[PDB]
Amino acid sequence: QYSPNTQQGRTSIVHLFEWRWVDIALECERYLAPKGFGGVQVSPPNENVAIYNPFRPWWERYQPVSYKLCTRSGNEDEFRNMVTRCNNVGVRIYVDAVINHMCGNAVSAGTSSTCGSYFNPGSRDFPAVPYSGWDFNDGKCKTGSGDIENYNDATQVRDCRLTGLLDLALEKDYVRSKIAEYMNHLIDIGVAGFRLDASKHMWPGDIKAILDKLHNLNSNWFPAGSKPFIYQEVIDLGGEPIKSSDYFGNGRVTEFKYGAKLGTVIRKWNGEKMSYLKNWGEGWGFVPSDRALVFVDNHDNQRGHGAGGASILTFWDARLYKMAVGFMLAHPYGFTRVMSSYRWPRQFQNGNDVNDWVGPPNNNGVIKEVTINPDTTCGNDWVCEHRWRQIRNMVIFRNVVDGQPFTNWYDNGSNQVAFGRGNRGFIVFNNDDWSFSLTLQTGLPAGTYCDVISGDKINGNCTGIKIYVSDDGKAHFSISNSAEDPFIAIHAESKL
Ligand SMILES: *[C@@H]1O[C@@](F)(CO)[C@@H](O[C@H]2O[C@H](CO)[C@@H](O[C@H]3O[C@H](CO)[C@@H](OC)[C@H](O)[C@H]3O)[C@H](O)[C@H]2O)[C@H](O)[C@H]1O
Numbered sequence: 313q314y315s316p317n318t319q320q321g322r323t324s325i326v327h328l329f330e331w332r333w334v335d336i337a338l339e340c341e342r343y344l345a346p347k348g349f350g351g352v353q354v355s356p357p358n359e360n361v362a363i364y365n366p367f368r369p370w371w372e373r374y375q376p377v378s379y380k381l382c383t384r385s386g387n388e389d390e391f392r393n394m395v396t397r398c399n400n401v402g403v404r405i406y407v408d409a410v411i412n413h414m415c416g417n418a419v420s421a422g423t424s425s426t427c428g429s430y431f432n433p434g435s436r437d438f439p440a441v442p443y444s445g446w447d448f449n450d451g452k453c454k455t456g457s458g459d460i461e462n463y464n465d466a467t468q469v470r471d472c473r474l475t476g477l478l479d480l481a482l483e484k485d486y487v488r489s490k491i492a493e494y495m496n497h498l499i500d501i502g503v504a505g506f507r508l509d510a511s512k513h514m515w516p517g518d519i520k521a522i523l524d525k526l527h528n529l530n531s532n533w534f535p536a537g538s539k540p541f542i543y544q545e546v547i548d549l550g551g552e553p554i555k556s557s558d559y560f561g562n563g564r565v566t567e568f569k570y571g572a573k574l575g576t577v578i579r580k581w582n583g584e585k586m587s588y589l590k591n592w593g594e595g596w597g598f599v600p601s602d603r604a605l606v607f608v609d610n611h612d613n614q615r616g617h618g619a620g621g622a623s624i625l626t627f628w629d630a631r632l633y634k635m636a637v638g639f640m641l642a643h644p645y646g647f648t649r650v651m652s653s654y655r656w657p658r659q660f661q662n663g664n665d666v667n668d669w670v671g672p673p674n675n676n677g678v679i680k681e682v683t684i685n686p687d688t689t690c691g692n693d694w695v696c697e698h699r700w701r702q703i704r705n706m707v708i709f710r711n712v713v714d715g716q717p718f719t720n721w722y723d724n725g726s727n728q729v730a731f732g733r734g735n736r737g738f739i740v741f742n743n744d745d746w747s748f749s750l751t752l753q754t755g756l757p758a759g760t761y762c763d764v765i766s767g768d769k770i771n772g773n774c775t776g777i778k779i780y781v782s783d784d785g786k787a788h789f790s791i792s793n794s795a796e797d798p799f800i801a802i803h804a805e806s807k808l
Pocket residue numbers: 371372373374375410415416417418419474475476477509510545612617
């Protein structure tokens with residue numbers, strides 16, 4: 313259950329947040345495949361509530377109406393087209409599965425849905441599934457409000473409504489079956505796995521019961537017996553009765569401690585320093601590496617809607633963000649997910665962004681196409697961090713050093729550190745307020761290597777910084793605290 317199911321040599325997935333199916337299919341062929349990306353996490357493909365107040369917020373997609381593959385990203389035909397084209401190019405698709413709940417209980421009944429399906433939250437009626445009052449936990453929840461009120465009580469966290477979201481009775485075989493029917497529909501289409509949204513709000517046993525009904529991956533693309541990749545969204549920063557480890561029997565889990573701590577470290581909050589990252593991983597209280605899905609930021613916490621707090625680094629913090637992502641992609645701990653977002657009118661008032669609800673770039677509610685600029689960046693307000701040279705090249709770096717051990721660690725006791733991966737890669741970071749100029753042991757064979765952060769290796773030549781490794785594996789590195797990118801990375805495939 314725990315394997316990403318990516319092609320050998322591809323070690324990362326990217327979240328193409330709110331991207332349309334047709335756009336992802338093209339990206340798979342024109343960029344993701346050639347650049348060695350392992351897969352794509354797509355936004356919920358199932359019909360959701362169409363919210364006009366505010367105007368089509370991104371979170372409306374987390375309020376299911378039915379399991380029809382009909383959304384602002386496209387219809388079933390477009391979804392299949394995308395999965396097939398991506399799979400045909402060796403890039404996997406992972407679905408953001410919203411199966412813990414339906415829409416908000418306060419939402420007005422009617423046909424304000426992405427596929428016109430009728431629904432009535434008040435009467436608990438979702439005929440397009442179909443679900444009825446008998447399929448929700450209204451009678452199971454014991455809180456006075458019917459909503460989750462105290463996280464110290466593991467029971468209400470699972471049986472009550474998350475911020476009013478109608479909670480499905482996942483103990484019922486009928487409900488489990490309707491969800492499996494939806495997920496099997498996707499697996500048969502060709503999806504390689506799923507992100508289980510709000511897993512903390514579901515009983516480990518109920519999730520397992522659902523997974524037990526899931527098919528193996530489509531044998532036209534995957535070897536027989538291939539199980540869908542499962543990564544459960546569990547927000548556990550410690551201090552709660554519910555632990556992410558309670559879900560290890562179903563698959564991997566999102567390690568929100570990862571981005572939160574890395575952000576605090578890179579920002580140097582409360583006296584933290586990169587030198588402390590020497591024992592990064594389980595040593596910091598994180599889950600086992602083979603059960604972790606890591607990331608610097610996600611669609612939720614990049615806009616203050618998730619765990620991590622104000623320490624989370626995002627594309628808005630471009631310089632520090634690139635370093636955090638680089639460190640993550642270079643370090644062996646966990647399975648890495650790169651974030652790809654869109655720009656929005658961030659407006660901070662009293663420490664809170666009042667425009668954190670804004671949906672993807674659009675024209676009258678119609679998601680804008682992803683355009684590619686001659687410099688390979690994206691237009692139409694799509695950030696496309698996965699296309700940033702510094703990030704794209706680190707994604708490749710991880711592929712190249714796949715399997716190599718963490719070694720040759722170095723640090724100045726402050727914020728200047730470096731480490732290698734076996735004899736296939738080496739990375740140096742300078743997050744101090746002074747320059748870093750020193751000769752280090754790289755563990756790499758002698759030769760001239762192109763720094764993949766400041767440049768690229770094109771036709772036997774480096775476009776950016778060049779590093780010279782001697783016969784003893786040592787090499788001189790020089791990084792000024794004023795460099796655009798205060799870190800250098802070199803690997804086996806960047807050698808001249
Ligand atoms: C997982 O799925 C979620 F729903 C729960 O973690 C996502 O949460 C986001 O979407 C919800 C739903 O739109 C949003 O809450 C809105 O709707 C509820 C219900 O009516 C309102 O409560 C009264 C709430 O104020 C609304 O904002 C969440 O705020 C949003 O974070 C989550 O991101 C997914 O990972």
